[PDB]
Swiss-Prot record, chains A, B:
The chain holds residues 414 to 794 of 883 of the full protein. It is found in: Cell membrane; Postsynaptic cell membrane; Postsynaptic density membrane. The gene is GRIA2. Residues 117-258 are extracellular. Homotetramer or heterotetramer of pore-forming glutamate receptor subunits. Tetramers may be formed by the dimerization of dimers. May interact with MPP4. Forms a ternary complex with GRIP1 and CSPG4. Interacts with ATAD1 in an ATP-dependent manner. ATAD1-catalyzed ATP hydrolysis disrupts binding to ATAD1 and to GRIP1 and leads to AMPAR complex disassembly. Interacts with GRIP1 and GRIP2. Interacts with NSF via its C-terminus. Isoform 1, but not isoform 3, interacts with PICK1. Interacts with CACNG2. Interacts with GRIA1 and SYNDIG1. Palmitoylated. Depalmitoylated upon L-glutamate stimulation. Ubiquitinated by RNF167, leading to its degradation. Belongs to the glutamate-gated ion channel (TC 1.A.10.1) family. GRIA2 subfamily. It comes from Homo sapiens. Disulfide bonds join C203-C258. The M4 transmembrane segment mediates tetramerization and is required for cell surface expression. This is Glutamate receptor 2.
Amino acid sequence: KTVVVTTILESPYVMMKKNHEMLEGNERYEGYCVDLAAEIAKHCGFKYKLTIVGDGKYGARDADTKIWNGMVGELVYGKADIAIAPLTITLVREEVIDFSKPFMSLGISIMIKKGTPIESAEDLSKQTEIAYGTLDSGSTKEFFRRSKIAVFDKMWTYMRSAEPSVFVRTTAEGVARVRKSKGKYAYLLESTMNEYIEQRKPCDTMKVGGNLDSKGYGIATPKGSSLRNAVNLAVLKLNEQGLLDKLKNKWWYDKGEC
Amino acid sequence: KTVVVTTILESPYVMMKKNHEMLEGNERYEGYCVDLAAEIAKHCGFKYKLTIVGDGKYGARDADTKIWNGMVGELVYGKADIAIAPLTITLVREEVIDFSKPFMSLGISIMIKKGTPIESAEDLSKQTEIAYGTLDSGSTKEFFRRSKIAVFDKMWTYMRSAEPSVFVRTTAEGVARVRKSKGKYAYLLESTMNEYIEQRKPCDTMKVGGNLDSKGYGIATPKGSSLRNAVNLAVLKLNEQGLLDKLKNKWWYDKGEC
Ligand SMILES: CC(C)(C)c1ccc(C2=CC=CN3CCS(=O)(=O)N=C23)cc1
Ligand SMILES: N[C@@H](CCC(=O)O)C(=O)O
Ligand SMILES: N[C@@H](CCC(=O)O)C(=O)O
């Protein structure tokens, strides 16, 4: 049986090939997670179909309806068999889906337009001239909503009521808002994506300060999946071979434009 | 029932208190993993007994007998219920025990005596004047034994036949060898331990170069354990609260002395 993979268009994890219009099926896509999916499938002995999550989201439980959206919802409601994506391992997600051991580390980080007078989360929290926000329906927004740490809770109180809205629907939208806001918007996003974007033309953004937390991305399966064990061992093998490190270098720094 | 915890004397994870002779049971010990054990036990609702692994080893399958030693052996053969220690998550261990998601990240790293003319693994591999080695019966030795990467395989070929032996029984022994060898021994160990020792008097050692790999420590349970799920969720909760970060700062840098 074909394993249905849910994933998300997020550079450099999954991207449309320039010539995608000329291609069919899995061959339309390229990136770190496209390469990882091929390796996991080879090691576990399955055939698969890459599908892009219909709503373009990572996944959160909707405030009103209590229904999971994004890739998490695709797994919870039986629409996909596995998620191979930069999907953060969290407690509330582990209650409803399984994760492999992590394939990549990350932490929440700050993106600024170059020259913005901000060095830290504390700096952001102590001012309002420079607006700041996060992606909707993902782990970064939930980090601020749940944090008991004074600085991060102060940031949440500001973000949740800021006008106009500081939240964005996609990473690309956060990046565009940093680039177009003349230093007046800073974006909170994962260090992996921040570091990729810092390498991309026109190299007008950068990561500042330390990471706010430390966590990982994992390959997720629905509870009860027969794939769980083999997928986990395959991630460990690919790490131990240095293949995950090779893929990070390939997609972050061999594509590097500054 | 009392949960029997296997752990290892490895600073700053588990250390004898200065006044341990005056104390009984769990109260004899202090450190990051002592604090972590108390938190995991509280969150999972169990009472526990800290025990120090009899052979002082992390764990490997003996070449001759194929019997697991160290903390891994304590779990495999039913002597302990859980390992709470800086125990690296590896494929061959995941086949025989379970691990939580990681509670800390690390990579293999190089420790030198200050002023040693070495900056990288490649530098070590291209010379023999400065001897270099690893801990026995752990994940670092196995990394070199199994590596297909040219520089690391060259290092393995040298280490496995070097005279006198470059391998040590405990981290303390590797550190002592670096300190007493006047620059003529470099020690390959995890970045966590390397960074701790760089802060300790007399501040005569340091970490050089990048990490050789990227991996994690996990809390381990024997296959079939009823503790597996609750332990994993407790690690995720402690991470999400910032408690793991607080404990790292407590044991590495709040008592650090350079
Ligand atoms: C949550 C923290 C503690 C920050 C963490 C620790 C380690 C990793 C990790 C990164 C890359 C590869 N691997 C291999 C599987 S692993 O050993 O389970 N962990 C990793 C990620 C996050
Ligand atoms: N990796 C995140 C999405 C990005 C973010 O929230 O910053 C998730 O799995 O929700
Ligand atoms: N953490 C390692 C021990 C230290 C090392 O091998 O450098 C293990 O679990 O085997």
